[PDB]
Amino acid sequence: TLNGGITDMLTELANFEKNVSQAIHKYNAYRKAASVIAKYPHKIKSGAEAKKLPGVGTKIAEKIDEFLATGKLRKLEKIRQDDTSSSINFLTRVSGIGPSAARKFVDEGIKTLEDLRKNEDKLNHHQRIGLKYFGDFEKRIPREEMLQMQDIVLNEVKKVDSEYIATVCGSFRRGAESSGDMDVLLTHPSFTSESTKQPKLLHQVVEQLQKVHFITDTLSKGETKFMGVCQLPSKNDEKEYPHRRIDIRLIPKDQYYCGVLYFTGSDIFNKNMRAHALEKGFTINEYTIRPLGVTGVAGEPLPVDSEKDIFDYIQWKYREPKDRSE
Template sequence: MSKRKNPSDESNPNHEFCEFLSELAEYEKNVNRNIYKYSAYRKAASALSSHPIRITSGKEARALHGVGDKIAKKIDEFLQTGKLQKLENIHNDASSVAINLLTRVSGIGPAKARQLVDDGIATLDDLKKNVDKLNHHQTIGLKHFEDFERKIPRSEIESIEKILREEICKSDAEYKITICGSYRRGKSESGDIDTLITHPSFTSKSSKSDLLEGVVRTLEKCGLITERLSLGNTKFMVS
């Protein structure tokens, strides 16, 4: 699965800062295509997300590793006004809004989103009328847009992990299943479920396609997989 991943949740005391920094990061990645600024915003958001105490000034934020002067000034602006002028400008720019929306569809990157917007496609409804412009992955991403946007509670991931173990190990008890990503880091909810599946015979020199195809078919039969997004020799993406 592919979803947007935010470095913070609402229980974090610095959630508001993380939210606007994440939004600025997405803008830089999707609209400006500036990976340097994208990384800087994400790094700052991650630093604030990990800080257990509410930040009360840009100067205080500046003391955190990953927060520079420009971002500290944005934090001061937000604390003083409750908003950011840069974000206000972004929200008032129709092209930026459309690109940021379309890149939330799994499989649609910044270049594809820009192409779609140039073709007059600005909303999900527009996209549904132009599915012929989408590849398989993007079509599935649009079909399950609401599902992909939804955060997955930890309890639900635990239930899915149990099903994975039971179903996959029915055919071979030597399979080992490990849930990774934000779940492994102890988060209360996740944007997707990253799963590592290993087997003693699955080596760098072995034929991998049969083993992986077998795992996918098993999970399709039990109803855990409803759509294939991609399937390679060593990894697959499904919904």
């Protein structure tokens, strides 16, 4: 973190554009700039030096010059003193409350944690759980706990069907010493791109993890994606562990490599890679990589037999998960 002050500033600006301005491309613009600067191996001396990096333009270079000269940004200082922006930015920190709902709540005079807690009936299910564990979801998960959780999930899954394979992805697979949550990729030979020979494949796993009281809440749940809450068990007289967010994604067995590429991330790495794929005349999702016709219509799925194959198609040198943290 040679440029922590700068990347913090850009992230706060990114969050402003997302939550208050509702300008998603500015949000992405700032986050991209923050990302490229984060991995720049020099302590930045000026905006001109930063402007040389892909993603940093004139407006951000000027902000970096202001920040380096004064240690702050007047634009951010103003935003911080604005009541509406500060209220909206706070509310969106609750999972399930986005920019639209946040602004709506503020209009109705619901703008503090305390307001939320007396108006539970005005929240949808996702939001109510987001409020419930607002404090816990703020906390990061030490990798040591991630390993305990991996152990539980992987063996409970084995107990349901020995042919399930569960892979912990996200920041954990990228080797992070702490994670924001747990991300699990799930496969079963009964579910392929060709057919689904068995119903309830995801359900039965969720069910089992609920039975052993690992999963405690459900934010959303469909045939292929589960979004919920989990908690490690604690020993006698021990204070309980924080409740954690857990995502489970069932992916067709034969499309594992596209799936694990997707779910390993990071989110910005995926955006950059998929954008690059477009420039190279391909499109990538969690299932396949497809060529683009001159028309701009996707073709048939190309053969993929490793994560590296996907990198090869778009003429990228392979990058291990630990080097995908952008």
